[PDB]
Design a protein around this ligand. Structure first.
Ligand SMILES: NC(=O)c1ccc[n+]([C@@H]2O[C@H](COP(=O)([O-])OP(=O)(O)OC[C@H]3O[C@@H](n4cnc5c(N)ncnc54)[C@H](OP(=O)(O)O)[C@@H]3O)[C@@H](O)[C@H]2O)c1
Ligand SMILES: O=C(O)COc1cc(F)ccc1C(=S)NCc1ccc(Br)cc1F
Length: 312
């Protein structure tokens, strides 16, 4: 299949991108250079990942080398929770643009549907360990996102980790100017997301699947947790197709009309992970992978669960 999906802003988005959460700053410049050299045209970034400067060094060097043109890249970043205030959104976006060495983003996402108290700390806590909210709601934050489109800073805006009702809230916003182009959510065989995906796709919102390999490097991993990459049932599908388990896990969301953003800093795996456009999972394979759903989430956070807009 086709390498790009059409968004509701009229632009095309590469269905495979490189994730950068947890990519060490001393390794991510080379990772992104290698990715672009082996064909990646989409990089998923975020201010909270603390490595955008180093991602940007790689992007800028590949543009300077003329390995790629800017118009051929699709660079995504995300507005962190401590910048859900009207007066802070532009500067947050501009800091990300500065760090990435860009004059526009292809897509800018509200990272989570929760706002936190502004300040230096990414997770401001009260003395009992609860996150300190902002009173700013998702609709006012969305209006601020829309302004970025109208100022030329970003080509598309979207959302991430929004539940059904939250997506609906944006779609139903009085005076809505731009619909979200994308909802980026966790999705893999243990968290298949059929309901939310159906909803978003029915509204013309493209879904991006994060943690498609189950995030084995997530900092809170525990022994006992399920492991996609080690699941013998998934290994068996991979062996049948003469592919790796990771390759199956990447191809799976692609065949659901999703965008997918596996992370690696390992050159061989970066290349591996891109070699997914030359085989097809059967419908039976797809349904079998869907059957592994256990509603198991990589990405949840106890400190934020009492926020009014916590999504899960
Ligand atoms: N919007 C959000 O809230 C949100 C949340 C989570 C993630 N994301 C985005 O989604 C991206 C992907 O999710 P993720 O980083 O959580 O995890 P992931 O992509 O599911 O898994 C990354 C892990 O898998 C390993 N790996 C990669 N390719 C492999 C292969 N071929 N064989 C074996 N192991 C392989 C990586 O190791 P090495 O790097 O050592 O090779 C790393 O430990 C993130 O980096 C971020 O860009 C967004
Ligand atoms: O968030 C990412 O992209 C990847 O994850 C992270 C990446 C970072 F650089 C720092 C924290 C996170 C955490 S802890 N994320 C989970 C999380 C954050 C906020 C809220 Br509301 C709920 C929640 F579940």
């Amino acid at each position: 299949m086709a390498s790009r999906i059409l968004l509701n802003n009229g632009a095309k988005m590469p269905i495979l991108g490189l994730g950068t959460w947890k990519s060490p700053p001393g390794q991510v410049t080379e990772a992104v250079k290698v990715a672009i050299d082996v064909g990646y045209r989409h990089i998923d970034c975020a201010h909270v990942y603390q490595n955008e400067n180093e991602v940007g060094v790689a992007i800028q060097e590949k543009l300077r080398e003329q390995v790629v043109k800017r118009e051929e890249l699709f660079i995504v970043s995300k507005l962190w929770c401590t910048y859900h205030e009207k007066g802070l959104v532009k500067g947050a976006c501009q800091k990300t643009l500065s760090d990435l060495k860009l004059d526009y983003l292809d897509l800018y996402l509200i990272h989570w549907p929760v706002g936190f108290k502004p300040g230096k700390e990414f997770f401001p806590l009260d003395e009992s360990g609860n996150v300190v909210p902002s009173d700013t709601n998702i609709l006012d934050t969305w209006a601020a996102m829309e302004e970025l489109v109208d100022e030329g800073l970003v080509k598309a805006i979207g959302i991430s980790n929004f539940n059904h009702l939250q997506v609906e809230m944006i779609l139903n916003k009085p005076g809505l100017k731009y619909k979200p182009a994308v909802n980026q959510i966790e999705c893999h065989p243990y968290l298949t997301q059929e309901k939310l995906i159906q909803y978003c796709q029915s509204k013309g919102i493209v879904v991006t699947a994060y943690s498609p390999l189950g995030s084995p490097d997530r900092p809170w991993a525990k022994p006992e947790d399920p492991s996609l990459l080690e699941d013998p049932r998934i290994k068996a599908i991979a062996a049948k197709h003469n592919k790796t388990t990771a390759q199956v896990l990447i191809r799976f969301p692609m065949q659901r009309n999703l965008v997918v953003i596996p992370k690696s800093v390992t050159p061989e795996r970066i290349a591996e992970n891109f070699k997914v456009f030359d085989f097809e999972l059967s419908s039976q394979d797809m349904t079998t992978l869907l059957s592994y759903n256990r509603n198991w989430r990589v990405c949840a956070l106890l400190s934020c669960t009492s926020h009014k807009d916590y999504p899960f």
